[PDB]
Design a protein around this ligand. Structure first.
Ligand SMILES: *[C@H](C)[C@H]1/C(=C/c2[nH]c(/C=C3N=C(/C=C4\NC(=O)C(CC)=C4C)C(C)=C\3CCC(=O)O)c(CCC(=O)O)c2C)NC(=O)[C@@H]1C
Ligand SMILES: *[C@H](C)[C@H]1/C(=C/c2[nH]c(/C=C3N=C(/C=C4\NC(=O)C(CC)=C4C)C(C)=C\3CCC(=O)O)c(CCC(=O)O)c2C)NC(=O)[C@@H]1C
Ligand SMILES: *[C@H](C)[C@H]1/C(=C/c2[nH]c(/C=C3N=C(/C=C4\NC(=O)C(CC)=C4C)C(C)=C\3CCC(=O)O)c(CCC(=O)O)c2C)NC(=O)[C@@H]1C
Ligand SMILES: *[C@H](C)[C@H]1/C(=C/c2[nH]c(/C=C3N=C(/C=C4\NC(=O)C(CC)=C4C)C(C)=C\3CCC(=O)O)c(CCC(=O)O)c2C)NC(=O)[C@@H]1C
Ligand SMILES: *[C@H](C)[C@H]1/C(=C/c2[nH]c(/C=C3N=C(/C=C4\NC(=O)C(CC)=C4C)C(C)=C\3CCC(=O)O)c(CCC(=O)O)c2C)NC(=O)[C@@H]1C
Ligand SMILES: *[C@H](C)[C@H]1/C(=C/c2[nH]c(/C=C3N=C(/C=C4\NC(=O)C(CC)=C4C)C(C)=C\3CCC(=O)O)c(CCC(=O)O)c2C)NC(=O)[C@@H]1C
Lengths: 48, 160, 48, 159, 161, 160, 161, 160, 161, 158, 160, 161
């Protein structure tokens, strides 16, 4: 148990979230023509 | 229908269907029989729903059935009612499908462009759909009405 | 010198947060030095 | 698309409102649905093995795998097993859907031409699909197997 | 600087609103917490020298920093580092009484990063020291005070890093 | 606030808060609840205090509401009353803070300059504040009134 | 239905509070207005037939409605419309005495829109007639009474529309 | 209230308010200010009226506060006093309204049924109200007392 | 309404089948239970007033509902609530004798939810009261009878919720 | 309360503990509030006794019956006088903060005294209970709780 | 504990708890929450208290940690510190209990005999406890310190 | 004997552990319950004679036991039985204050079964009496206190049986 607890408290948990490369990088979606084979997919492609 | 939606999400992810996704499909197939009954009810009442909604619309908008207005004249008034009938048929299709997609492909894409060429006012069309919803809701039982309402609301949102 | 915004609200701080719960939760209970007959007649929700 | 949507589309071209006869066809699908879901879960869990068994039956221990064969070299071998997986995943999708259309729209369209340019042998691929079908049939069980088989056969016929 | 009472007032003043019951309740909340805070502050002031000593022992000393060519090598630098530690402690105590983190931003946090970079003081080591002080402080103040004390220490640490 | 003032003195001296200073903080937090009630009373009576004080001021100074005078006209009279309201709000803030500093920053620094540009007479403004004090005192209990008086007096002193 | 006095009472009853000075002030306000209202009501009752006549002249008659194919064409329909006008007037008078709009909602307003839509009576024209009655009434009652009278007429108009 | 009653009678007759009815309204509005004071007096003396009346009731009816009796025990005695307080509040409402209608809706309809389920004796409740009347009468001036008496009497009549 | 005997008959009548042994067995089952049910019904009828009193004491009274601003505040509302409680009890007794839940659906359950929603009566509290009555009833009737009694009470509760 | 603390210390043969001293301090602060509670009951004394008496006689018809001890004017007065005595003792208790004052005057030898008189002890207890209920109503809730303890003790003793 | 003591006295007398005894129980339960905090503080600072006290003791008594002395050597010094830790744990137990009894049973009865067999000097042990008290007092607030002091003093009194 | 506070202490002492938060929580739980318990104890002491009377009436008296040849026949035996009942009540009250069942084991429960068997006192009847006392006590103490009181009564009953 001790070896998986923080040595220091982490008293404001929000600070320690949102450290690093921002989440935006992971959130975003990729669009391809191979996915386009539908009328809605195509509309998403174009908007993108 | 719903199942198509689930498959499409899986294909995008390039994965087999998730258990949770599969469960939702199971729920949908069970719900379908109830949905069919709701659709059946509206189909039977279709003629009256259209008629009542039309009258309400014309009262709400005198202009549409006026010499300037698009709806004016017997031929034109019939066409306006035919349009209302079309939208009702689409709504029934939606309820059985469990998704707006069937409705959307036939009626909501390019609708703006079509009506603009016709010169029909889009807001009036929306009012007609709203009117149909109110009539339909009354005939439907409350829970059934809520289900039907969602599809009706989508149409109103689309033509807006 | 550019003036600085507030990162944290007063209520987020632990001691205040606690004191708010204590007044908020069990805001309505039984009042001492109030005759019981007056207390039983008192309304909690008030308006609404 | 789907069995449900197929019924809807047939009515829409007619312009007819949904009728009891139409409803009955939809009802038929709904009963089959539960079986299909169970079959799909079986296939997903055993997918890796299904491919392995089918490869063992047809692809490996063959000229293809031997030098000068289409599936020779790691890169080509990996490509072939990737294709096998595709066929399996799409067939599973089709079985749930109850419609062969998805196979036509994604898998079947342009595959023949792609394979001819690549020099991949179609008949061997078809053989592999048939092998997968046989393995799948066992796992899913008889009632499910009939439904599963039609989609596999559809892929084979297209290729 | 700003304190909880003034913070409420300022929020109302920008709105132009007279003080209302909801605002009053927040003020009332602060007033109850006040007594605890004062006790904590007195504890910290009395044990300040020890708190710094313990924290330095935990993180700063017996290290490359203290060894020649390290940032805390030479008496002058050593003395500077412990003076900085004392500053952080004093300001945290002020913040705890105030009930607001603003004073830390206005006095300690503003320009610290830039100062340290020019000096070549290591920020991560400093942060380590602050965290160490927090742990020691938490013990002395006791549990109710500890949570309140910790947030200001963490605020300093986040600012520096 | 009292606490802010104490902290500021300590920071200038570069020392931790003295025990005596800490004791004063303790006393202030105890007093605060009483102070809140005093402030609440004035807030409730605010509308009437302003109205009564305005009338008294205009009686005391006919000139301000005369065609020559700054206050004269509806628009101008409203603004004069708005100013009185502002000062009352500031006083309430002061009572809860226990210090004049909140009052001082918002209202007393640059006040001379602002009013001179406006051409409003400063002594009249002071009279208005005095008038408000008298009204406020009557509604407050004697000890409460004394506390409130100090803040009112400060304002009068500031506008001199 | 409800009246102003009862409205105050009901608000206090849900709170469970005894009547207080602030509440008393609202009641006192009503009592002063009361005398004016009584005078206005008597004026309206005496001139009711004329009020309707004048309002009809202003909006309803000499119009397409009265002409063949119009809603108010035929004696039967004409008589119906003036009967409705009388209803609105009587209820507005009741509301004015009461000092509360509730009676209008409970009796006149409830289901009227739906009834009219089924009948094909034109709502906008009806609203026009109500507004016309208001103007005529305003004259007879005199200015102080007119303000009070107007709100109830406007309430009816808003409900119908 | 008086006004509600008059309107209701008129609506039943389908007529505008009669002159006589209008006159009664006029009288009521004149009386109102006096009525407000009477109500205010009772509100201030409420706590003592209830206490005194309770004691009188318990003297009049030893049984109610006896082991058999409903009122017996602290919890129960408090509830009995709470009920007396409720009725007093209703009476004040009545005086301002000038009619028993406000009283009647809250307190007199279904009262028999409620008390029968509780098993509280209705006559004892009536005695308590009578007791409250006597206390209230003493504090009120004679004319004021007569007005208050009518409302008190109604309550006693309603519940017996 | 329908009872168990009639329910069997009706099922056979739609089939057009003459009564058969399997059907007879179901009827026979009911006949054995019958004697117990009759005894239970008599117990409930005699103790009905008390049952309601006890159940109200358990859930409804000494609560926010009875306090001002609560649904059961005012004598009129209090009386209404206890009247509803009596209805539920009487119908449950009828259902227990009948051996069929249908009567509850036909009379009590139909439209109740909608009525309550318009009235603003709280369904969950009502359900609570029904459950309380069930508990009291269970005691009086005794164990064998209680099982039979409970199902009808539960049926009412499920319908309302 | 102070006497009690001293006595415990003397038994232990030690000076009073700080904690014990603190309790004494709290008691002296509370005393003023206690005096007010006692004052309230004193003012209402006449009515409390009268009301309690009536309740008791309703509860026990027998005591005021030709056979019963309480029967007759002289006897009924004595019964009420006894109730008054107990109320006076209760007030003394509240100010003292201890039952000891009550106990010495009223609860030791009470059984023996009443047995000679032939007065029924349970009836006396009921009268004290009755007085408690009347007293509770006049007192505010927190005040009533304090008063209740002393009343309960008497009932327990009897 | 306080409560145990009260119960035991009652049982000896074969009576229900006296009002006075009950009052003491009430006081104790109110005090308990404060007591818990005091105990918690010392527990957290335990490691430092022991360390500081040890150093003080060794300075006060060089001999104990000298080749002749009992405490001398690493093993022995650890044991001496362990003993100090034990006594601190006992003190915390005492504070929560509100009585010395918990302390007394574990640590003060037979202590002389145990240490005499060990040959540890009792006065030195007492000094160590005194040292611990001083450290503990500094960390505690004044009122808290007084409470803690009593328990510390008892230990010192017990051991001589 | 032992009490809840001491029980926690003793458990920690055998482990040698300093008091920890989990332990603190148990102590804190006791402290909250304490005030209720004190009130309950005072209620029981005042009503002790009646509690015994009621319980005896419910189970012991008007029975074969009191009739000649029964265990509680003769004044001497009757007096003994009510004395035993008082013991159980007093000890249960002690246990409730303590928050621990140990005192019951140390004083009442030890050797009781054997004593009763030699005496020929009927255990089941005694248990019945204890249960009866519990029910009476539950009423007087009120619900929150009743749950706490019940466990000790049940403990006695289980020991005897
Ligand atoms: C390791 C000792 C420490 C550590 C590493 C760490 N790095 C990142 C993120 C980034 N690293 C770089 C750095 C570089 N880009 C360059 O071109 C060069 C010079 C050639 C360097 C050194 C970059 C650009 C990033 C961000 C972009 C990316 O990650 O692709 C992280 C965060 C990674 C994340 O996914 O959040 C970390 C943790 N952190 C430690 O704690 C060590 C002290
Ligand atoms: C020896 C005569 C005395 C003594 C010394 C002592 N020192 C330490 C620890 C440190 N001392 C230093 C000192 C210096 N650092 C510098 O930069 C300079 C100038 C160049 C000096 C002289 C430092 C930095 C430390 C900290 C450890 C580290 O280097 O990281 C100790 C032990 C520390 C402790 O208290 O635990 C001691 C014992 N002590 C005596 O009593 C002698 C009189
Ligand atoms: C002529 C013989 C007498 C006369 C007539 C007169 N009429 C009006 C006004 C109106 N008359 C009508 C009548 C009808 N509307 C209908 O639908 C029918 C049945 C088909 C009838 C009979 C109406 C509606 C009006 C109002 C105006 C309009 O048409 O919108 C007037 C004018 C009065 C006025 O001030 O409006 C007159 C003079 N009056 C006489 O003195 C003759 C004896
Ligand atoms: C006059 C300004 C307008 C007008 C009136 C009009 N109304 C009707 C018919 C009806 N009107 C009502 C109205 C009410 N019934 C109610 O119960 C209430 C509230 C309690 C109202 C206000 C109803 C129900 C009817 C139908 C039956 C009846 O008249 O008793 C008509 C005739 C419609 C018909 O075909 O009979 C008319 C003319 N219409 C206008 O065009 C004017 C603007
Ligand atoms: C006192 C003169 C008599 C007495 C009172 C008594 N009442 C209850 C319980 C209730 N009393 C009410 C009454 C009202 N609710 C209302 O809305 C109004 C009008 C505004 C009244 C008067 C109610 C609802 C209750 C139920 C409990 C609750 O409030 O939640 C009791 C106790 C009930 C019981 O024992 O079951 C008593 C004693 N009883 C007498 O015998 C006195 C003569
Ligand atoms: C009659 C002169 C008086 C009187 C009598 C009375 N007794 C009871 C109840 C009981 N009486 C006894 C007594 C005895 N049991 C014994 O073993 C002996 C010696 C052999 C005696 C004398 C008992 C055991 C009971 C309890 C019930 C039972 O019999 O099992 C009552 C009823 C008590 C009640 O309140 O329920 C009464 C009335 N009462 C008088 O006042 C007379 C003066």
């Amino acid at each position: 148990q001790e070896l998986g607890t923080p040595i220091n408290e982490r008293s404001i948990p929000e600070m320690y979230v949102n450290q690093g490369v921002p989440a935006l990088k992971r959130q975003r979606k990729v669009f391809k023509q191979s996915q386009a084979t539908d009328r809605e997919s195509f509309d998403a492609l174009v908007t993108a | 229908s719903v199942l198509t939606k689930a498959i499409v999400n899986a294909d995008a992810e390039a994965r087999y269907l998730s258990p949770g996704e599969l469960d939702r499909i199971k729920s949908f197939v069970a719900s379908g029989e109830r949905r069919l009954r709701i659709a059946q009810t509206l189909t039977e009442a279709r003629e009256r729903i259209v008629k009542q909604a039309g009258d309400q619309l014309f009262q709400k908008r005198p202009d549409v059935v006026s010499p300037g207005g698009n709806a004016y004249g017997e031929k034109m008034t019939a066409l306006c009612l035919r349009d209302l009938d079309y939208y009702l048929r689409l709504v029934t299709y939606g309820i059985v499908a469990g998704d707006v997609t069937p409705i959307e492909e036939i009626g909501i894409i390019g609708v703006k462009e079509m009506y603009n060429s016709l010169q029909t006012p889009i807001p009036a069309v929306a009012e007609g759909v709203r009117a149909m919803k109110n009539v339909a809701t009354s005939l439907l039982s409350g829970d059934d009405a809520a289900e039907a309402g969602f599809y009706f609301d989508y149409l109103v949102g689309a033509m807006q | 010198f550019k003036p600085i915004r507030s990162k944290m609200d007063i209520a987020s701080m632990p001691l205040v947060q606690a004191a708010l719960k204590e007044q908020q939760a069990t805001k309505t209970a039984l009042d001492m030095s109030r005759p019981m007959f007056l207390e039983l007649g008192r309304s909690f929700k008030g308006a609404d | 698309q789907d069995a449900i949507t197929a019924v809807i589309n047939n009515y829409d071209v007619q312009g007819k409102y949904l009728d009891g006869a139409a409803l009955d066809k939809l009802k038929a699908y709904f009963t089959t649905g539960a079986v299909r879901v169970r079959a799909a879960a079986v296939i997903s869990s055993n997918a890796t093995t299904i491919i392995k068994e089918a490869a063992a039956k047809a692809l490996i221990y063959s000229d293809l795998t031997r030098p000068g064969g289409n599936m020779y070299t790691t890169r080509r071998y990996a490509a072939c097993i990737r294709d096998m997986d595709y066929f399996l995943r799409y067939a599973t999708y089709a079985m749930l859907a109850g419609d062969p259309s998805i196979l036509d729209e994604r898998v079947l369209n342009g595959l023949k031409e792609t394979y001819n340019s690549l020099g991949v042998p179609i008949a061997a691929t078809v053989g592999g699909i048939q092998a997968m079908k046989e393995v799948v049939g066992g796992l899913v069980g008889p009632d499910a197997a009939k439904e599963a088989s039609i989609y596999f056969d559809y892929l084979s016929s297209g290729l």
